[PDB]
């Protein structure tokens, strides 16, 4: 009867206050349709490619409960992978607690890559002053932490790193990120080896990369001289090459501490509003 939809709506209203089970990353676009046989139609949460999705609980085999990561979002019926696959086979047939969901931490790590190589005092004082701002401002929320392991290494002879950074230790650090993100606190990593955003592309962590831009190589020349410069030039020129629209979420091209900190702080407040809907509490 129609009562099952009412019990479903009750399960949803109960779901809205529930803590997140696990976030996932979509690999395909998906629009809602009446043929989808949504248990509670008009509540379906459609998603574009590479959309992030918090998941609260398993409503049923055909549908999971969860929410999209964006402002104004509310709890709803995120489609199950089996349902998406069944609709895929159906459309192909009509044509005549690989897979659609990559696991991601509930809170994305933030890596402030650039201007160039890490481990040198210029860029080190740069990013460190940045973490100082992020710490004193986002007090009681932000959870900055160092990662000695190279997280970029994370993905019938068993795979093994030839580097001192053992892959098992990397797995341990990844689990530490999975635990740290469970608290829904802000996270901003201080990874050492991550000189370029592309290295983290294979990671399931889905990092919030930050781009502290210096468009002019000569400026950074005079900067590093003002206090290993050449490899720093190839690296900075390399980061200059990268596509801003996708590779980076934020460009800290601002020179003074004040305005740049205002931008990145406003950004993190935007993400903070995105990750914490009123209905959750």
């Amino acid at each position: 009867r129609r009562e099952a939809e009412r019990q479903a709506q009750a399960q949803l209203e109960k779901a809205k206050t529930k803590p997140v089970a696990f976030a996932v990353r979509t690999n395909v676009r998906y629009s809602a349709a009446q043929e989808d046989d949504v248990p509670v139609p008009g509540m379906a949460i459609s998603f574009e490619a590479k959309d992030f999705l918090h998941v609260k609980e398993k409503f049923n085999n055909d549908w999971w409960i969860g929410r999209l990561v964006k402002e104004g979002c509310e709890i709803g019926f995120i489609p199950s992978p089996v349902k998406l696959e069944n609709m895929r086979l159906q459309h192909e047939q009509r044509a005549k607690f690989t897979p659609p969901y990559d696991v991601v931490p509930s809170m994305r790590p933030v890596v402030l890559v650039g201007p160039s190589l890490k481990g040198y005092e210029v860029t080190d004082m740069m990013q460190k002053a940045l973490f100082d701002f992020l710490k004193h401002r986002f007090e009681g929320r932000i959870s900055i932490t160092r990662v000695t392991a190279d997280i970029s290494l994370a993905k019938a002879i068993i795979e093994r790193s030839n580097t001192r950074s053992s892959l098992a230790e990397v797995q341990s650090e990844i689990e530490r990120i999975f635990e740290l993100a469970r608290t829904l606190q802000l996270v901003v990593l201080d990874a050492d080896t991550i000189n370029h955003p592309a290295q983290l592309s294979k990671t399931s962590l889905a990092p919030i990369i930050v781009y502290v831009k210096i468009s002019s190589p000569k400026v950074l020349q005079r900067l590093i001289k003002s206090r290993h410069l050449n490899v720093q030039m190839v690296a900075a020129d390399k980061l200059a090459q990268c596509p801003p629209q996708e590779s980076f979420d934020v460009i800290l091209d601002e020179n003074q501490l004040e305005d740049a900190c205002e931008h990145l702080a406003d950004y993190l407040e935007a993400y903070w509003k995105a990750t914490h809907p009123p209905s959750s509490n």
């Binding site: 004082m125 740069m126 002053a129 210096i214 468009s215 000569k218 900067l223 003002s226 206090r227 020179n255």
Partner: peptide, 29 residues
């Protein structure tokens, strides 16, 4: 006169150093 202006102009039609001073100010912090 303005016609002479348009005549010359019809065919006639610092960030580096600012980045230098501002980023030196950045390391200065």
């Amino acid at each position: 006169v303005l016609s002479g202006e348009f005549t010359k102009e019809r065919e006639k039609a610092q960030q580096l150093e600012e980045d230098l001073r501002g980023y030196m100010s950045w390391i200065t912090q």
